[PDB]
Amino acid sequence: PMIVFVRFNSSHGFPVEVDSDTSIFQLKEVVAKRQGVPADQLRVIFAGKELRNDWTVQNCDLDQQSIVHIVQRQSLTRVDLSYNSFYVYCKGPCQRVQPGKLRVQCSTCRQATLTLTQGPSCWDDVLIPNRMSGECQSPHCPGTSAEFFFKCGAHPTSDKETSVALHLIATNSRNITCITCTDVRSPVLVFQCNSRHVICLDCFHLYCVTRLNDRQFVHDPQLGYSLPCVAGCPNSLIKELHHFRILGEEQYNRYQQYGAEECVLQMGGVLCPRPGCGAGLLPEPDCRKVTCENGLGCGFAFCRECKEAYHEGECS
Amino acid sequence: MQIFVKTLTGKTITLEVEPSDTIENVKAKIQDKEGIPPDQQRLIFAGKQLEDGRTLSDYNIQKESTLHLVLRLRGX
Ligand SMILES: [Zn+2]
Ligand SMILES: [Zn+2]
Ligand SMILES: [Zn+2]
Ligand SMILES: [Zn+2]
Ligand SMILES: [Zn+2]
Ligand SMILES: [Zn+2]
């Protein structure tokens, strides 16, 4: 036996115990009795698809305590974008990289009632907004645009309990050796250089930690603060910066802080030199007098060039 | 959902947002809390300057994540 959560026309999810071999029609019957409606007017929507009455729960790839939407009047469970599953960063309760689930909602009413016209065939289809289309089966919604989302697969997750997809991470099903340690591990991160160099998560973490602490991350105005392929290949900066979640919580926050500092500096700004401040400031380019100014700054007025208290004339 | 906005001093503000909120909405919320006019705010996530027309979901910004705030000085 297993439990399936049912959201009945956007209602709060109630559990239904089923068997692996329970048919969708049987599930429609019990929900029908509970809601006082005829079963023939029910439609079951899951993972971007309407489930047919003759399918069984296990045939529909319904995991334990997942959620189906029921409305009135290729499955995303089997998609492979490139076991070879997807991975997310689960911020809680796992606080780690975990195998993920690909799901989809209506981009206009934000409910998982949109059925896809076609399934996604590449990461771009699920990562680029509005790339895929469908019909929101909600009674009063004219939504036609799909909004994909990801959930951690290591425990049950509510409908809005989403996690960021780390689309460079792949199951190492073919035992590719790590470019840096030469060992075989799973999963691995695949850089988007021409060579598609593969690195294990142990070495990727150490790569990130050592480069962060040495201020060797790279600032790119279009992408942010990132790192390229460990082998130095060109045009290989990581674009989805949540991959640096592999740093762990403390170092990830230090990464975000350093990245913002570097962003200020690249925009031609200055970091306030007063001890205990360090506020990021963007004065006029021609301006030598910089004042760290309702509750954000420390009030220090300093010379942009020598970083001492503002002074007339040449520095020193 | 809850997100945090921090200056580079570590000063922290908390906002209630939706993933579909634009960066301009986020700046209006910051102005509502701290009085900083939006024209002086620059928001940064993971080192990337955030654009007024984009949404939090456009940057995959998650519940409880942090944006960094730096200030444009117009006086200077
Ligand atoms: Zn998890
Ligand atoms: Zn809708
Ligand atoms: Zn390795
Ligand atoms: Zn490479
Ligand atoms: Zn200051
Ligand atoms: Zn000076």
UniProtKB/Swiss-Prot annotation, chain A:
It is found in: Cytoplasm, Cytosol; Nucleus; Endoplasmic reticulum; Mitochondrion. Keywords: Autophagy, Cell projection, Cytoplasm, Disease variant, Endoplasmic reticulum, Isopeptide bond, Membrane, Metal-binding, Mitochondrion, Mitochondrion outer membrane, Neurodegeneration, Nucleus, Parkinson disease, Parkinsonism, Phosphoprotein, Repeat, S-nitrosylation, Synapse, Transcription, Transcription regulation, Transferase, Ubl conjugation, Ubl conjugation pathway, Zinc, Zinc-finger. This is E3 ubiquitin-protein ligase parkin. The chain holds residues 1 to 378 of 465 of the full protein. Changing residue 132 to V: In PARK2; uncertain significance. Residues 74-177 are annotated as: Necessary for PINK1-dependent localization to mitochondria. Changing residue 157 to A: Loss of phosphorylation. Reduced mitochondrial localization. Residues 174-316 are annotated as: TRIAD supradomain. Belongs to the RBR family. Parkin subfamily. One of its GO terms (molecular function) is zinc ion binding. The keyword Nucleus applies.
Curated annotation (Swiss-Prot), chain B:
There is a cross-link at residue 76 (Glycyl lysine isopeptide (Gly-Lys) (interchain with K-? in acceptor proteins)). The modification ADP-ribosylglycine is found at residue 76. There is a cross-link at residues 6, 11, 27, 29, 33, 48, 63 (Glycyl lysine isopeptide (Lys-Gly) (interchain with G-Cter in ubiquitin)). It comes from the Eukaryota. It is found in: Cytoplasm; Nucleus; Mitochondrion outer membrane. Signal peptide: none annotated. Residues 1-76 form the Ubiquitin-like domain. The modification Phosphoserine is found at residue 65. The record marks 54, 72 as: Interacts with activating enzyme. Phosphorylated at Ser-65 by PINK1 during mitophagy. Phosphorylated ubiquitin specifically binds and activates parkin (PRKN), triggering mitophagy. Phosphorylation does not affect E1-mediated E2 charging of ubiquitin but affects discharging of E2 enzymes to form polyubiquitin chains. It also affects deubiquitination by deubiquitinase enzymes such as USP30. The record marks 68 as: Essential for function. It is a peripheral membrane protein. Changing residue 68 to G: Loss of DTX3L-mediated polyubiquitination of histone H3 and H4. The modification (Microbial infection) ADP-ribosylthreonine is found at residue 66. Exists either covalently attached to another protein, or free (unanchored). When covalently bound, it is conjugated to target proteins via an isopeptide bond either as a monomer (monoubiquitin), a polymer linked via different Lys residues of the ubiquitin (polyubiquitin chains) or a linear polymer linked via the initiator Met of the ubiquitin (linear polyubiquitin chains). This is Ubiquitin. The lineage of its organism: Eukaryota, Metazoa, Chordata, Craniata, Vertebrata. The chain holds residues 1 to 76 of 229 of the full protein.
